[PDB]
Amino acid sequence: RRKLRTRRKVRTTTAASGRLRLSVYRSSKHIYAQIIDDSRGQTLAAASSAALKSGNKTDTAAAVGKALAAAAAEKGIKQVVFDRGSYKYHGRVKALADAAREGG
Amino acid sequence: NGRDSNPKYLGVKKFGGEVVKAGNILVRQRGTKFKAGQGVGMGRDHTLFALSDGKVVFINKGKGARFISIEAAQ
Amino acid sequence: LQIVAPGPRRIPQELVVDVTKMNIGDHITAGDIKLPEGCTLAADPELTVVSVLPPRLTAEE
């Protein structure tokens, strides 16, 4: 239930990978996807549907997914990364992946 | 009755502070008694082993919060 | 009985309990005990303090 997320968040052994963590978090029809430095106590490159209304139809995640992809690529930093959450695949969340993955 | 069987030799092989090699065994215990931390693997029999050479260190507070980890030297 | 309060000049050095009322099988509980000057009971009100025990009885061989 509230272990949905903590099943996934722990599913990724963080600093053992060498990668970074990308936390997509959906609440409203808006999504905030942010990328975190696991080893260090910090975060790297934010995105949002906040200043947005880029697209009308959620699947505006395409924008924020590409927005992060571009905002991060200025810092360099593209491997796999990719956290997730209580939320499943395909749909609205995969509109974000393919906007970053192959879009970044 | 008279039927008890065998020693079984479970222990903590490399204690904290010690310099492990790659492939050394850090702990022998039964199910989970110590949790594998940074730089430490775990096998069929549980039994943490060393992934990377370095210094071994113990970390715990309470319960199942016990952890074994490695770090390099140079 | 632990009770409490207020003055520890005036502390309840004893507790007077009148038993003439009770006879047999009667369990006097802690809500029946007199504690002047607002001394709150420490334990449960219904906790048994004084109980008079019945005479020794037997039937079968």
Added chain:
Amino acid sequence: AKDGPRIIVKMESSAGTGFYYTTTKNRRNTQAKLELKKYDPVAKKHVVFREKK
């Protein structure tokens, strides 16, 4: 490892031919439906033939 008239069995693998063997332990407990699995021989890889006998 010991063997008798009883349930389950030791059953060999197919011809990855190659004329080859695997022989995992098996059981007639679930079903007699026989079996086929995937393995690799001398030739190629993953040539997948049927549990014999």
Added chain:
Amino acid sequence: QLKTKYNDQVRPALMQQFGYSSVMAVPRIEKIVVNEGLGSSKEDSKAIDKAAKELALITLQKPIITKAKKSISNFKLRQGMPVGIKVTLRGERMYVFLEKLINIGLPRIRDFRGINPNAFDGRGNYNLGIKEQLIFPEITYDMVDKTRGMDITIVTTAKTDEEARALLQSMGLPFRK
């Protein structure tokens, strides 16, 4: 198909009377839970499937067969195979059944003064006092195996038992008088 009747009149009646901070704070009904225990039926592989058609034809929603867990029971509990059937009704499909029963099914009980008004669930939830299975409109003595009955639970958002029976007005709320 109702759902309008809950709307308007049901809400302010308690809201304009006792009062509520919202139209959301107003007591609702989440789901109608219907489960017929087949434990008394040892037919199993034979007639257990029949009680599924009974509940599926009435609520238009397929029943899920519950299971043993095998327990002990000291007389009969075993393994496995079903021991009972289950269907949960929520939304409009609850509102199709609920309306269907109060208008039609309930009057079909002999000498019906209404279900027991005494406290059901202090947490605000309510049950159904269904005894016979034949009392339901779709069920008749024409087509049946034996004389049996099923249980039904009304799951409501009422915060109090006091406010439970209160919401339970409107919808066909007989009493003990």
Added chain:
Amino acid sequence: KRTKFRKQFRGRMTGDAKGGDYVAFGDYGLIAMEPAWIKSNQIEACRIVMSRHFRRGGKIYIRIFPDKPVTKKPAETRMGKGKGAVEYWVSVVKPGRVMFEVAGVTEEQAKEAFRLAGHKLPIQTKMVKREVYDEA
């Protein structure tokens, strides 16, 4: 006395009295000065002794109680295993531990009723009164 189902066996060791108080459940009580075992009888006879000297009144409290099972030679020698399941049950008591306590009887009343039960006891003993009040 002898109890219902258990672990069934024991060895032996001796410390000092842990869970025996000074007082409890009455005005007067009995305290053991020597480490020892007390059996199912003994204390059973001690109850009977004390009560015989009373009105028979139900005012007597026994804090002690047999748990530890002890064993014995079936007939003789060392041939075979350890054995003797039911021989007797014992209750270990250590010094300072309070054994029996009485209610409502007077000073000499319980002085003599402890003295009678003083014999039948493998150890020396002394009765008492309350100063330390501990309930928690």
Added chain:
RNA sequence: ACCCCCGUGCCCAUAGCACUGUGGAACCACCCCACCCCAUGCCGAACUGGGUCGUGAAACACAGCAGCGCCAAUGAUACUCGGACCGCAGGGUCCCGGAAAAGUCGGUCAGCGCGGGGGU
């Protein structure tokens, strides 16, 4: 910078629960409808998907509060490495450092970051 919200760590109950008070177009949440994506071994309750009004009720968030939990001294004791002993025995003592558990006095309803949205 400050107030605060949403995310996400470290710590890994002195940060936890119940009683409870504030919060609402900015954020969260419910709510709204959904033939199809997708999905409930029955129910879109859960995932999922289309979006307001409403609502601040529930859930969440913060402030309150020391009734319960959890942490918990100093004193003394139990036991004990070493030294030296009494008892026929069960057992016991002296010196020397080490030194608990419980209990009481109390202490609390946390701390410390990263990023973004919104007021001043």
Added chain:
RNA sequence: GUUUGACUGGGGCGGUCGCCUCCCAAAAUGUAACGGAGGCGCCCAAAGGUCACCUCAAGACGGUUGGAAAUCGUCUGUAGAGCGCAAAGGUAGAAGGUGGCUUGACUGCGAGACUGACACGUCGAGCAGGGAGGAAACUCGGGCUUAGUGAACCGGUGGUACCG
């Protein structure tokens, strides 16, 4: 012509020999008794691989041939459950409950360590040939682990093609 075991508070009668778990075991490992208890000589083609979701025992109230016990509902619910078997450890971010697809319950090796007088035995990163589940990081060379076993000899079967 030979065989007819040992252990053993004398020998015999009785029981016992290997393997796993707890106590004994004196807070490292190790440690004996014809000491104190109990189990193994299997099972699982899915109880495996991976990929997703799921959360238990029990009580109280209310509910229908169904009452101690059923099936349903709400509330409580650091586990008082479960884990194929014996106990100990272990487990709620699961190893436990359910499905999708599967054949890694793989061939060639094996850094470096646990343990043993030896012979055995246990764990294992990583490399290659090939795969499997996933979108992906990744995981997989049987199972929560610890019992489910037999050196060598002599030989049966399928290869292979060195000796001849």
